[PDB]
Amino acid sequence: AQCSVDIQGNDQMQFNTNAITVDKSCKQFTVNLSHPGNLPKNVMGHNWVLSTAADMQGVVTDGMASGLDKDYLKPDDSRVIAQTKLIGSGEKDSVTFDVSKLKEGEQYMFFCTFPGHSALMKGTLHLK
Template identity: 45%
Template sequence: MLRRLFPLIVLCALWCASSAAFARNCAITVEATDMMTFNLKTLRVPGDCTQLRVTLKHVGRMPAQAMGHNWVLTETRHHRDVGLAGGRMKLADDYLPRNDARVIAHTPVIGGGQSTEVVFPTSRLRRGGAYTFFCSFPGHWNMMKGTLVFG
């Protein structure tokens, strides 16, 4: 019986190995400071990544209420409007409009010494698309930003 199942087992193993080779999970760590800066201005995500994990570390000391930061990703054309809309929201909303379809991914707002992360499928991105990541804390979005390049 094992002799009959062996070819099936080999086929299953090959299929699993090939699926894993095509499905790559990628990770990036971004640091935010009390000086309203990210340590990275450009994030490059390989086109074979099927999922992206972004870890945000607030390396400053100030609390979220005074100098909180989050990581928000939108298409570049939506960056300004989402940033302005976020300025009208509250900390409990992570300074983002709820269920805003323009937001591809975001982390919660964190304070100094904290870290957080977001994991999202790259199927929401297109190769060569224009993407901006930023902090939506009021007043931060226009200077605390960078570019995400996919592909």
């Protein structure tokens, strides 16, 4: 079975995937984030952060306030289910989390927390 997805965040402030449906049989799910292009993390950093649909705005806003040195995320934010590092061009990072953290009927959102990125960067996630 497929329990992984490869996602790219580029210099155009776009994710190449904006919808992920996780199979219920998967024990763990993996997101492999990469950054093709030429721009560094201080100006075009991208992360893949997962929260419930209701918690998205709060994670993004409190993330902007945390700054670059904290990867634009409130440290150990309880609303964050899974997160990758903030990556620049030529860098990559993967995050694997337990599918038991996802509930039937609940809606999740994945997004980048770099200031302003979430306007285009993102997508929906839920159990298949």
